[PDB]
Nucleic acid binder design. Structure first.
Lengths: 271, 46
RNA sequence: GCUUGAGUCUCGUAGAGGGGGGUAGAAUUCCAGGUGUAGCGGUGAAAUGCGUAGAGAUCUGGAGGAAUACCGGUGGCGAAGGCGGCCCCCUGGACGAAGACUGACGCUCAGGUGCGAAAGCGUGGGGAGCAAACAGGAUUAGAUACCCUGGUAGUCCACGCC
RNA sequence: CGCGGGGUGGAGCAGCCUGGUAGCUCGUCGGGCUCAUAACCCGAAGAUCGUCGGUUCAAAUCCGGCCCCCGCAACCA
RNA sequence: AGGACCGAACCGACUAAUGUUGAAAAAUUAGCGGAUGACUUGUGGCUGGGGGUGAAAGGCCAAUCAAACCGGGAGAUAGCU
RNA sequence: GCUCGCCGGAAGACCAAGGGUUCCUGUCCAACGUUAAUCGGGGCAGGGUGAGUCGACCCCUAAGGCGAGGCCGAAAGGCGUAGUCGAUGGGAAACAGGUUAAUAUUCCUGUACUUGGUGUUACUGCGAAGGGGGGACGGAGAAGGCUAUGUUGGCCGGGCGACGGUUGUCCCGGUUUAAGCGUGUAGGCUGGUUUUCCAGGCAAAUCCGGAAAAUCAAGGCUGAGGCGUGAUGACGAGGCACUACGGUGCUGAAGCAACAAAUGCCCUGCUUCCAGGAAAAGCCUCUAAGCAUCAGGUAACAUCAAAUCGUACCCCAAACCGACACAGGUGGUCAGGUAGAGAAUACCAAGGCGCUUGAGAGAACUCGGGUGAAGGAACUAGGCAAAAUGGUGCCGUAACUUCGGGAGAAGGCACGCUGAUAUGUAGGUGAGGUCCCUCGCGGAUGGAGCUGAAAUCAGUCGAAGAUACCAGCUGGCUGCAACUGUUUAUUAAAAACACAGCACUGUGCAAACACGAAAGUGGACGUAUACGGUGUGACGCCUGCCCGGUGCCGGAAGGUUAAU
RNA sequence: AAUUCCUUGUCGGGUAAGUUCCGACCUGCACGAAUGGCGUAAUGAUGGCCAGGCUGUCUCCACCCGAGACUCAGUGAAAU
RNA sequence: CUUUAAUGUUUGAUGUUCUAACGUUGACCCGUAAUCCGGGUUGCGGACAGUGUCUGGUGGGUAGUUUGACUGGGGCGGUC
C-alpha cells in the first residue's frame, strides 16, 4: 500500500511509494510483448507537435486483450504483472484451452480466480458480458463504444463507469467525468471497478521522478519573451494579458468541444 | 577549443554526396548549374 | 484445608449493545416534460429575492443525498461517551432456573494502557437538506446582531489524528 | 516650476462649465416627550460664496491677478 | 536505500593574476562546483528560416542571428556624406 | 659515446576516426624549418603494405531513409503499404615462436579450427515467406571462487668488488611458454521420464502451450579456473665465433614453490528495487504445400574451395580539427615497482623525451616564486589576493529541527625508530602426514611453511615523528531562493529557469491541441486516478472584500441584423 | 523592507567613532495574500554584517631565486 | 372590408419515422506471404455529418503600414 519514505536525503523526504507486494516481480510473459519506440512527441514531419513529453525510461508494449472475443471459455487467472504502459496492473489470464492473454485487473481480483467472458458467465467481478444482460446500476469498466471495437471507457486505475438506465438498444452511462452518455446495448463491459486505486496517492517526490516518466520541463509563458509566447515580456513579472495558449487560443474557461455528429449520444454534460 | 569542422567521410557522402544530389530535383538542378559552370570537381567523392 | 466471597458449566429470556454488508418508504431539492396564468415567497410591517425569458400551484417520469415518522414509553441496552426503519453476517455483556464444579483465586489502584459527544485538523470521496464565514434587505441613533432572501467550510463516507 | 483641481452657514457636500429666487444631511437654538438625559416628534435661526480687481443692467456662476490646499509632471546623457 | 557525503578520471567555469598586434579570434596558472545521476560520452539518425530548437538568455542554428548563409530581383532606394 | 635532467594512469604502447605515402634507404640544401644546418615530417630517385581464421565486404535487423501499387496535392511534390536499404548492435573459425632497412595473428616453422561444395560408404522420410523454442538484453549491491600480475624463497649462472668492511644472514641477473584437444571443478539454473486427452498456437503438426494420471527420484544443461597434452619443442642469462666490424653463424644453464592479488574472469550469474528494462537472422525443432524406388536428410571417410577490398605511417599529435612544425580540442584498449585508502601525489622500470635561436651581463621595471624585525585589516569599494587550516584512530560536541540532520560542528589527545610481550602476535592461507569414501579437480583430521595487522610496556633520536609532496579555515546575526539541477558558447551563474507539490480550466475518444493549403502523423497503440493549457512553486499556518471595467460561461424573450 | 522619496527617520544593541548590520516603533511617498502573504530545518563557487585564527593586504617596504628587459651573433614583424 | 369557419390547393417552418445518397479511425472475407489501399458482405449511424460558393461575426495568430511641425538640443507644455 502507500508507504512514506524516510527523509534521509532531500528529494526523498517527500517521496511516497506505492508498494504492491501481491504482484509478480519477475520477467513478463514474453510471447505477448512487442516493442514501443518513443515518439519524443514528434510526428512524421519531425516537428514537435506535443510539447513536454520526450525522453524517459524505456518500456515495452504488452499486448493487453480488450475485445474479449472468447466466449464460454472459463479462465483461471495466473499472476498480476506490472504494466508500465498503463496505470492499472494487468493480470496474466490462462484460458482452459492453453492460450494466455493479459487483461486489466479489477479490484476484487486475486491469483487463481475463475473468470469467464460471454453472455452466460456470471455477475461475479472480472466477467465481460454485453450490457443488455447487465443489471441496472451495477459498476462496470472497459466499456466499448461500438461492438468489437475493443474497449474505451474506464481503463485508468480505480475508474469505473456506472450503468444508469436502459432504453432500447441504447443504455445510459454515468461516465467517471460525471457526463451522462448513451451507448449501444450490445457493447461489452467488464464487471467491477479497475484495480490499483492508490495510483493517485503517489507523490513521485523529486524532479527527476517525472523525468524518467517521460516528461520534460514546462516553461511558463511569463518567463518567455513576447515573440515566443502570447504572454511574456515586461520588466518585472508584469502580466495583464488575458490567459491564452501559446497559439493564442483562449485558455481558462474557453470551450473547445464541437463534433456535431457525436452530440446525439450525450445527455448531460460534465460539471 | 573544439572547432566547427569534425570530419566524417560517411556523414559527408550521405549528405553532399553524388547520389544525395541525384535524389531531389533541386539536387539535380545543382549539378546542372555546376556542369554549366564547367567545374571539374562536380561533387566530392572517393 | 472449608465453602457463605469471586469464578466456570448446562437449558433459557429480553434489549435503539457493537462492527460489517444489503434493502425499503415518505419527503425536500434538482432536471426533463404536460396543463395553466399573474403573481409567488417572506414579514410585526416591509424589502431584497424569484416571476410574462411563463414563476409558483399542479401532474407524469427521472437523478441524487441525508435522516429515519407514528411504534416511543421520568421505556430498554451499554463502563462512560452513547445507541432508534427493515434484513442478513461476525460478536460482547447482563439476568433467571435448577443443580454441578473449583476452593479465597478477592477489593482498590499512583505511575501505565485503552475507549472517549460536538467542534476542529490530515489524505481521498460525496454533496440533497441545513448552515458558521460571507453577501444583500430590513430594524435601529448606530446593528459588525436578533428578523428576512441567499450562501461557503462543515454536517455524511473510509482511514488517521485530537 | 509646468499643467490640472478646489476654496460655499458651525462640519461635510451640492449649485458653478447652462452670468436672472444659494440647497441636502448633520450640527445649533426653541418647544414637546420623560422622574431626568439620550433617542424620537413639531418648529426656527443660520452663508451673503478664499481674495483684490475687471466685465456686464446684473458675477457665488464669465475673465485675470494674488493667498493657501490637492493631484499629475519635474525626463535623456 | 539516496537527483546522499568526501574525492581523481570526466564534465563544468566561481574568483584572481598573466595574456589583450597572445602560445590562443576566450586560452594558460593557481585555487573552485558536480562527480550513480534531471550524469557524461562515441557512432548514426530527425527537426530549417518568420522556420527550427530552447530547465527561457530573445539564447543556439558551421567563429555570423530582434530573423542564417548562398545566388537572383538589383546598378533596390538614399532630400545624406 | 659518456654523463646530467624531465614524463612514466604518460610527455609510454596499441587502435578507431581522420589524413593519404608523411614509413624506410640513397642523394641534395635553392626554397620550406621563426637562426645556422652536413639534418628533416623539405627537394629528387628507388623501395615498401602478402590473410579461409583480424577488419570490411557478406547474412540480420534498430532509429531512420527511399518506396511498386495506393491515398492525397495547381504542377513541383507530400505521406506511406508490400518491399528494400540502414551499425553504433546480433551472426562460423588461430595461436605461439622466428624473420625484414621498412610488413606481418597476413611471410616462414610448428601445432590447430570452421563453413560450404563434390564424391564414396552405411543408414534414413525430407521439405515453408508458415508454427514454436532459442537468440534476447535494466539498474544498484553483495561477496565467494580464480587468473592476469607482482613479491619473496629455492634453483641456475655470474660476482667477491676503484675509499673502510664484504665467499656470506652477501651482491647482480635469469627462472617464460599459448591456441587447440582431454578432464568436466568451484559455482548457477532446473524436479525428471513414460503414457492419455485438447474449444489454443489465422491451416496442420508427433514440436509448443494446457489437462490428467502412472513412475523414479535424480537426471540434464550452463560453467571460470585448475590439472594433463600441445612441448623429450620453442624460448633462454650468457658463452663459442668472426664480422663490409652494421651484425650474422654455432651452442646453451636452470626453467620450481609459497604468498599476495585485481576495476579483469566465472557473472548474458546471484540477491534486491523500481523508473520495469531493442529487433531480426544464423541456430534447434514441428509439420503444410509437395515428392517418395527418387529426391532429400543424417553419420563417417576422402577431396576441393574459402573469392574481392583494407593492411605502410601518424593516431591526445609537428601527419587529424584549429590560416602555422599553434602552450588549444578529440573516442576506445594496456597500465609495472616503493610508500599510499587510492587510476591522487612523490621517486622510479620498461619506454620515450630535453619542447629548432643561442652566448653573455646580473640595472630600473614587469612576470613567476621564497623569506621577513615589531605591529596584525590600521589597507581597501570589499580581508580581493596571499597566509593559515589540512591526515588516521579515540575523546567530546551547541542553538535549532521537517527528529534524517545540524556534524568532519566547535575543541582536544596520541602518532617516528628499536626491543620485548611474540627468536613476528591475533588473523589469513594451507603443506606433510594420517583417516574415510557413492574413488576424484573427493571429503575429514591434521598443522609445516609463508604471509601478517593492531595494541600495551620499556628504551632511544631530533628544535620539530599526519616531518616530504599530498591534505577542510572556523564561528555568530541576517536577506533571498526550499533542496540536486539548468542558464546568456565569446564580459552577467543569480534572488533568474526548472522542480516535486497545489489550483483553475479544457477534452467522452475519429478527444482536446499541434505540424501539414490535403492525405496523414503526433497526442496514444493512452481513455478522465488519463491527457492539454495556464498560473503559483517543497513543508507548516493561511489564502480576506469587490462582478463596476475587461474576458469567458450560461440564457434566450424583446430590439437591431448579412447574403437569400 | 531587494519595496521608505523627505532619511544618515526615532530609540536600543554593536564600535574609541558605525550613511552599512541586527532588534524594535508604524508617519506603509508607493507592503499584502497563489502576477501569493507570513514563517522555515537543510542546502548555496548567492547578497549584507560581526568575531577568532591567520597573514607584506598595510604602517614601510628590504633582500633573494628563476623568466624577460640590457649587450653580442643570426633571423626579422606590426599598427601608423 | 371586420373576422377568419371548413374544405381543397401552392409554399414555409417545426416534430416524429424510413433508407437508397453520404459517413463509418465497427466486425468479417478476397486481392494478399500486407495494422496501407481498394473491392465485397453485414451492423452502426443517416439526409444530419462533412466538403464547395456566397455571407455576417470574431481574429495582433500573422502581415503591411502609419504615429506632424515649430522648438533658444530634443521630450513635456503651448501654439499652427
Amino acid at each position: 500500500a502507500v508507504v512514506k519514505c524516510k527523509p534521509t536525503s532531500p528529494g526523498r523526504r517527500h517521496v511516497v511509494k506505492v508498494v504492491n507486494p501481491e504482484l509478480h516481480k519477475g520477467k513478463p510473459f514474453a510471447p505477448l510483448l512487442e516493442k514501443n519506440s518513443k515518439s519524443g512527441g514528434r510526428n512524421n514531419n519531425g516537428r514537435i507537435t506535443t510539447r513536454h513529453i520526450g525522453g524517459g525510461h524505456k518500456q515495452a508494449y504488452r499486448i493487453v486483450d480488450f475485445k474479449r472475443n472468447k466466449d464460454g471459455i472459463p479462465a483461471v487467472v495466473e499472476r498480476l504483472e506490472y504494466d508500465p504502459n498503463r496505470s492499472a496492473n494487468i493480470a496474466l489470464v490462462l484460458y482452459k484451452d492453453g492460450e494466455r492473454r493479459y487483461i486489466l485487473a479489477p479490484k476484487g481480483l486475486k491469483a487463481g480466480d475463475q473468470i469467464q467472458s460471454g453472455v452466460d458467465a456470471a455477475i461475479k467481478p472480472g466477467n465481460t458480458l454485453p450490457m443488455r444482460n447487465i443489471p441496472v446500476g451495477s459498476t462496470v469498466h472497459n466499456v466499448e463504444m461500438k461492438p468489437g471495437k475493443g474497449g474505451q471507457l474506464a481503463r485508468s486505475a480505480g475508474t469505473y463507469v456506472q450503468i444508469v438506465a436502459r432504453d432500447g438498444a441504447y443504455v445510459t452511462l454515468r461516465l467517471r467525468s460525471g457526463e451522462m452518455r448513451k451507448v449501444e446495448a450490445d457493447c461489452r463491459a467488464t464487471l467491477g471497478e479497475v484495480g490499483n486505486a492508490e495510483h493517485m496517492l503517489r507523490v513521485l517526490g523529486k524532479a527527476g521522478a517525472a523525468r524518467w516518466r517521460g516528461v520534460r520541463p514546462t516553461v511558463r509563458g511569463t518567463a518567455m519573451n513576447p515573440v515566443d509566447h502570447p504572454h511574456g515580456g515586461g520588466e518585472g513579472r508584469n502580466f495583464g494579458k488575458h490567459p491564452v495558449t501559446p497559439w493564442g487560443v483562449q485558455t481558462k474557461g474557453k470551450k473547445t468541444r464541437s463534433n456535431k455528429r457525436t452530440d446525439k449520444f450525450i445527455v448531460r454534460r460534465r460539471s | 577549443m573544439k572547432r566547427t569542422f569534425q570530419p566524417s567521410v560517411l556523414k559527408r557522402n550521405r549528405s553532399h554526396g553524388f547520389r544525395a544530389r541525384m535524389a531531389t530535383k533541386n539536387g539535380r538542378q545543382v549539378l546542372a548549374r555546376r556542369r554549366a559552370k564547367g567545374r571539374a570537381r562536380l561533387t566530392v567523392s572517393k
